[PDB]
Design an enzyme around this catalytic site. Structure first.
Site, PDB file in Angstrom:
ATOM      1  N   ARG A 104      18.282   6.710 -22.888  1.00 33.83           N
ATOM      2  CA  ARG A 104      17.961   6.415 -21.484  1.00 33.83           C
ATOM      3  C   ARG A 104      16.744   5.463 -21.362  1.00 33.83           C
ATOM      4  O   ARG A 104      16.589   4.743 -20.367  1.00 33.83           O
ATOM      5  CB  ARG A 104      17.668   7.718 -20.736  1.00 33.83           C
ATOM      6  CG  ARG A 104      18.849   8.680 -20.612  1.00 33.83           C
ATOM      7  CD  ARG A 104      18.377  10.002 -20.025  1.00 33.83           C
ATOM      8  NE  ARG A 104      19.379  11.080 -19.949  1.00 33.83           N
ATOM      9  CZ  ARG A 104      19.736  11.899 -20.941  1.00 33.83           C
ATOM     10  NH1 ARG A 104      19.260  11.749 -22.160  1.00 33.83           N
ATOM     11  NH2 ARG A 104      20.629  12.852 -20.726  1.00 33.83           N
ATOM     12  N   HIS A 191      13.365  14.307 -19.538  1.00 38.60           N
ATOM     13  CA  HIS A 191      14.813  14.391 -19.424  1.00 38.60           C
ATOM     14  C   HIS A 191      15.417  13.435 -20.432  1.00 38.60           C
ATOM     15  O   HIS A 191      15.774  12.289 -20.099  1.00 38.60           O
ATOM     16  CB  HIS A 191      15.266  14.039 -18.013  1.00 38.60           C
ATOM     17  CG  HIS A 191      16.750  14.053 -17.845  1.00 38.60           C
ATOM     18  ND1 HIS A 191      17.495  15.137 -18.100  1.00 38.60           N
ATOM     19  CD2 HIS A 191      17.631  13.050 -17.473  1.00 38.60           C
ATOM     20  CE1 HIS A 191      18.788  14.845 -17.875  1.00 38.60           C
ATOM     21  NE2 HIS A 191      18.867  13.573 -17.495  1.00 38.60           N
TER      22      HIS A 191
HETATM   23  C1  LIG Z   1      19.111  -4.146  -5.782  1.00 41.91           C
HETATM   24  C2  LIG Z   1      20.152  -3.091  -5.977  1.00 41.91           C
HETATM   25  N1  LIG Z   1      20.381  -2.167  -5.073  1.00 41.91           N
HETATM   26  C3  LIG Z   1      21.396  -1.310  -5.494  1.00 41.91           C
HETATM   27  C4  LIG Z   1      21.900  -0.214  -4.793  1.00 41.91           C
HETATM   28  C5  LIG Z   1      22.917   0.547  -5.340  1.00 41.91           C
HETATM   29  C6  LIG Z   1      23.450   0.231  -6.582  1.00 41.91           C
HETATM   30  N2  LIG Z   1      24.488   1.020  -7.147  1.00 41.91           N
HETATM   31  C7  LIG Z   1      24.538   1.480  -8.421  1.00 41.91           C
HETATM   32  O1  LIG Z   1      23.799   1.082  -9.318  1.00 41.91           O
HETATM   33  C8  LIG Z   1      25.593   2.529  -8.681  1.00 41.91           C
HETATM   34  C9  LIG Z   1      25.956   2.616 -10.142  1.00 41.91           C
HETATM   35  N3  LIG Z   1      24.904   3.269 -10.908  1.00 41.91           N
HETATM   36  C10 LIG Z   1      24.894   4.574 -11.165  1.00 41.91           C
HETATM   37  O2  LIG Z   1      25.672   5.370 -10.642  1.00 41.91           O
HETATM   38  C11 LIG Z   1      23.879   5.014 -12.185  1.00 41.91           C
HETATM   39  C12 LIG Z   1      23.829   6.509 -12.425  1.00 41.91           C
HETATM   40  C13 LIG Z   1      22.635   6.916 -13.258  1.00 41.91           C
HETATM   41  C14 LIG Z   1      22.728   8.308 -13.838  1.00 41.91           C
HETATM   42  C15 LIG Z   1      23.790   8.685 -14.639  1.00 41.91           C
HETATM   43  C16 LIG Z   1      23.863   9.960 -15.169  1.00 41.91           C
HETATM   44  C17 LIG Z   1      22.878  10.895 -14.909  1.00 41.91           C
HETATM   45  C18 LIG Z   1      22.934  12.275 -15.510  1.00 41.91           C
HETATM   46  C19 LIG Z   1      23.147  12.253 -17.037  1.00 41.91           C
HETATM   47  C20 LIG Z   1      22.083  11.441 -17.760  1.00 41.91           C
HETATM   48  O3  LIG Z   1      20.862  11.803 -17.519  1.00 41.91           O
HETATM   49  O4  LIG Z   1      22.381  10.509 -18.490  1.00 41.91           O
HETATM   50  C21 LIG Z   1      23.301  13.651 -17.599  1.00 41.91           C
HETATM   51  O5  LIG Z   1      22.253  14.169 -18.174  1.00 41.91           O
HETATM   52  O6  LIG Z   1      24.370  14.226 -17.487  1.00 41.91           O
HETATM   53  C22 LIG Z   1      21.819  10.518 -14.102  1.00 41.91           C
HETATM   54  C23 LIG Z   1      21.747   9.244 -13.572  1.00 41.91           C
HETATM   55  C24 LIG Z   1      22.948  -0.848  -7.301  1.00 41.91           C
HETATM   56  C25 LIG Z   1      21.934  -1.609  -6.746  1.00 41.91           C
HETATM   57  S1  LIG Z   1      21.140  -3.014  -7.398  1.00 41.91           S
END
Ligand SMILES: Cc1nc2ccc(NC(=O)CCNC(=O)CCCc3ccc(CC(C(=O)O)C(=O)O)cc3)cc2s1
Ligand SMILES: Cc1nc2ccc(NC(=O)CCNC(=O)CCCc3ccc(CC(C(=O)O)C(=O)O)cc3)cc2s1
Ligand SMILES: Cc1nc2ccc(NC(=O)CCNC(=O)CCCc3ccc(CC(C(=O)O)C(=O)O)cc3)cc2s1
Ligand SMILES: Cc1nc2ccc(NC(=O)CCNC(=O)CCCc3ccc(CC(C(=O)O)C(=O)O)cc3)cc2s1
Lengths: 330, 329, 329, 330
Positions: A104, A191
């Site tokens: 991470r 974490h």
């Molecule tokens: C200027 C900008 N404004 C925006 C606005 C919105 C977006 N939108 C996205 O980025 C959506 C896509 N991104 C994700 O969904 C990332 C999720 C992260 C994650 C994944 C797993 C876990 C839990 C896991 C672990 O910790 O690994 C475990 O322990 O199970 C925790 C966190 C981009 C931009 S760019």
């Protein structure tokens, strides 16, 4: 007009919401947070924000179509943060996520750059919200949200080890044949790979497992309880490998924290906050310790008495995070 | 061992009492799963699919949320023995329609899949109700009924529960009333030939058609017919934006699961055999309002339809019957 | 008939799957009933009592709220045929303590009543779990066990579940933390001889006794012993103010019902036979931490008590066996 | 102190609740309201008020002792209305109740005099609240509370016929073998002897029962459905005769209204509001009609299309209430 034949209006009434939550990011994690929050009746309005406009609109509509089955009468979305005005709680789930076999900590610079856009926009429209950071590396990103927002530290919370601890208690319960609700134990620190299982506090019904097995969690442990923590550490990696990403468990963990905040419960959770002062930490490091969580965010921290081994491991978690944090510019 | 130092076992093997199986761990299957878990409907949840890594990963991800739930056993396997003693088995497996593809075009692919899934499901769960979600759902409920050899009360299609929820959402938005207090029935095919029952659309028992007799016709100054068009088009609009649909169908299925598991005897527009009604003489399945409880559909409400509504419903029936004539067992 | 004009019946159905009976419609029984209804634990709720007017009135008053509930059948009778096929039967009948009166003073009155109740319950639900709430609960759990002929796992006393809840509330108020996050156990007799296990009292795994070695002793600067004293005196203080207790015990009983009905296997401090532990050689029931699920009490946690804690418990033990040994029924 | 060894305070505790509910009156109705509200997780703070000190404290304590099993972290009580400060919803259940064979309308002078004390003290400390009137006669007392409070009429709501309609739907479902949730039917007008069953609206899945049986609800009805309404009217008296009082059904009915208010649901309920200007009524009569209920109380009224007989019966209910209401001095 059909509506005026049916209904006599008595009150115009811009319905300003009283328990609004915003989720930033409609990736699998954001949407898992959204569904869990909807199904726990925590909000009177839910707002979604993302930068991919078709995806965002479709998720919103998909949720809206289930409205008959819910008790959250307004669900809205936009790329424009004006949609987020008057949020009590804003949950940030945006950013890059780790590949299979990647730390991470490898996401830090990319997600810091994203937070430089996101966080001021959130603060502009909800200057008094609590911020709940879920994006990784969550401990560092909670520090960064705090510095960028200018909020007092009580109002900037990292989801931290709430999930690691839930996983620990699940695995513990599987071994013992007891519901996780009755199996207690705390995973603190990062974490990530350097999280610290507090063996000294692991118990069922107030019975310390370490008192029954003095070597609990060490190499000399005949039952190898350390492998339970290894499983906790490896959980995301394993689920990513199998399914491609994780979503449901984190969604539920985030909804658990949202519940304590929104309902002012003052339950204790292992979540990321500033630990400057404790266990001899002198810098602005954020990491998970047990915190009292309520309507004003983190109001109090529980001082765990750590063994020299546990304190050593926690110092090292703290060191690893400061090692990355130190170089940051934003 | 540590477990034996800590805990004295006092008791010797129990059947789960309220088990649900979801077949298919696509977005729909997993939405059904999370909704069912968060409504505390089951004491055991089983998942089945053919993609083994994906299946195990989904099971594990739900498992890790166990602290936050009240469903103490979550299990999965490619092998249907894992589904043993289910009270309800929800089928969400199969092909899904592309943008501009009719649900009816899925029939031969999903029939072939059902020839495998259905005998394996019923094998291990003598007390189960079969809830079909896969499309074309009305046709597949008939297929599941024929293959399973179950009595009709036990084989239910998710049908127009979601179409009616959508209708009520849209009606609610027009009127500024929660969908719970906006009443209106979409019947027939879960698809392009569904029938909005204007004669029954009401708030607090007040018929909107009695206030505007043009309601839902081309002469309607407010074009309420467009609400039904939006209902028909909703899957394709969401598919076009997001690539698939999941949350609303998951919630709709959990709504039906609730009525079955809790023996509520609420009325739902769901797919059942309608031979005998509206001059329909063949074994057509389609959505009418059904009383749903622990034995599945025990009773059917006979909606009094206007002549035009009845002809539209018979046209839906004819369409579906036409596709049923293509089926080879 | 109108019903048949509106509804076509498909089949004549069978028995509920998640039935609970509450015996006794005094304040405690009804508090159990409403808490159970609001937690959606049962598909049928049956009430039994000997005062027929009161029984019918309580049943009707609950029935009138059915729209707001998800328990589709609520029934009552003096006749135990009404309790048939219950999974859980909760006994709240009997004399209750006036102000200043000991629970032990109730023992012969309630033993006499149990001689009528228990055989009738077992006749209609031979496979049920019995949850005894009437006092003195530890002795009446023994009595119900002996009379019913059930195995000990299926005869459970509410015991110290409430005492422990009160302890955690008082602890929470002192620390500014939700009771859910404040941990501590009161074990032994549900009465004046209960034992607070100071060694296990903690928040987030941090032992309060480790911070203050004198916790719970007379040397304690903050007199935490007074928290256990308040626990002991709770029912008496509430009886003095309001005339009886109801809400807290109702909620406590619903919590146990939840673990049983949903097979949760949570750990609760409830009355069970502790022969074989702590140098107890006789058939004594009192509260220890029990894993509670669909077959009742399957397992006991072995709490490592200090020499004083264990002495206090063996004293709680002795107090109860004194009376119990000489009961005639 | 031990608390300070265990916990480091990070935030000065200026606690102000966000979703507080107050119940005035700790009789059986008041306490049924309280437990139902607690079990629906509607409030972050529950305040109780009464004039009998011991009974009040006992009830508060008994609720407090169940805190482990609830999600309402603060329960308080006092004879003093300062305890009710910042309530979003205040439910009035105080006053005399009818003996067997006494009309609710006979309680009016006693309960108006009580309201002259209660209502100004409630609005003194909760300027933002909705007032939910449960005490009887509820329709007239809603009018009285409105006049006394200085609140706008949208924010003064009587529990009205929400219960009578729930009773109607229970009996209907019992006859048809359908859950009340799917059996629709409205009882309007007075919460009392002059209530009006709207037979024209009674349906399942949109199918009018009166269209199936044109005699529905008349004396020529072979199945005697009029007896369903008679049982609705007689419900309170029958339960009072058997049990001494009613509590559970009204408690659930009040919690149902509180859910719509607290969660801004905008569901439609048959509750007490001003009906001047409908059905030819010229005076400030309050009675039950279907109303949209949300965070600002009653925002909208549904105009039910009644048969001439139904409308005459409703007009008669209004006349009965006015006959008592026109004599009031306060
Ligand atoms: C200027 C900008 N404004 C925006 C606005 C919105 C977006 N939108 C996205 O980025 C959506 C896509 N991104 C994700 O969904 C990332 C999720 C992260 C994650 C994944 C797993 C876990 C839990 C896991 C672990 O910790 O690994 C475990 O322990 O199970 C925790 C966190 C981009 C931009 S760019
Ligand atoms: C021999 C074999 N055994 C198995 C076992 C498992 C699997 N597993 C899968 O097939 C998993 C992937 N499949 C899906 O998830 C299909 C979902 C269908 C769907 C999509 C949308 C809507 C609602 C929607 C609309 O109606 O279009 C609207 O109206 O919103 C309803 C239904 C394959 C096989 S092969
Ligand atoms: C042959 C016959 N068959 C029947 C059948 C039914 C009935 N019916 C009744 O007897 C109904 C009236 N009786 C009660 O309600 C007794 C309540 C006992 C109670 C009170 C308080 C607490 C909690 C309390 C504490 O534990 O002390 C605390 O800690 O707060 C627990 C238990 C009589 C007969 S006679
Ligand atoms: C200056 C003062 N301040 C205060 C403050 C508090 C109090 N406290 C009390 O008065 C407590 C005792 N009073 C009650 O609890 C009355 C309940 C009324 C009730 C009963 C039944 C139903 C439903 C029922 C039906 O409508 O009859 C049906 O239809 O089922 C509705 C309403 C006195 C004073 S004096």
């Amino acid at each position: 007009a059909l509506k005026d034949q049916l209904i006599v209006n008595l009150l115009k009434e811009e319905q300003v919401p009283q328990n609004k939550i915003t989720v930033v990011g409609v990736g699998a994690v954001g949407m898992a947070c959204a569904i869990s929050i909807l199904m726990k009746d925590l909000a009177d309005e839910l707002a979604l924000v993302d930068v991919i406009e078709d995806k965002l609109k479709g998720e919103m509509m998909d949720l809206q179509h289930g409205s008959l089955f819910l008790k959250t009468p307004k669900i809205v979305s936009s790329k424009d943060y004006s949609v987020t005005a008057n949020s009590k709680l804003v949950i940030i789930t945006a950013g890059a996520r780790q590949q299979e076999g990647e730390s991470r900590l490898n996401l830090v610079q990319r997600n810091v750059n994203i937070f430089k856009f996101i966080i001021p926009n959130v603060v502009k429209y909800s200057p008094q919200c609590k911020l709940l950071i879920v994006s990784n590396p969550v401990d560092i990103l909670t520090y960064v949200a705090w510095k960028i927002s200018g909020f007092p530290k009580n109002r900037v919370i990292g989801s931290g080890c709430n999930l690691d601890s839930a996983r620990f208690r699940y695995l513990m319960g599987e071994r013992l044949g007891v519901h996780p609700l009755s199996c207690h134990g705390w995973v603190l620190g990062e974490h990530g790979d350097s999280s610290v299982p507090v063996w000294s506090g692991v118990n069922v019904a107030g019975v310390s497992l370490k008192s029954l097995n003095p070597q609990l969690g060490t190499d000399a442990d005949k039952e190898q309880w350390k492998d339970v923590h290894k499983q906790v550490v490896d959980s995301a990696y394993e689920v990513i490998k199998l399914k491609g990403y994780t979503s449901w468990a984190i969604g539920l963990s985030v909804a658990d924290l949202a519940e304590s905040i929104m309902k002012n419960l003052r339950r204790v959770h292992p979540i990321s906050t500033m630990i400057k002062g404790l266990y001899g930490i002198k810098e602005d490091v954020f990491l998970s310790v047990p915190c009292i969580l309520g309507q004003n965010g983190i109001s109090d921290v529980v001082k765990v008495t750590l063994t020299p081994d546990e304190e050593a491991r926690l110092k090292k978690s703290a060191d690893t995070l400061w090692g990355i944090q130190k170089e940051l510019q934003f």
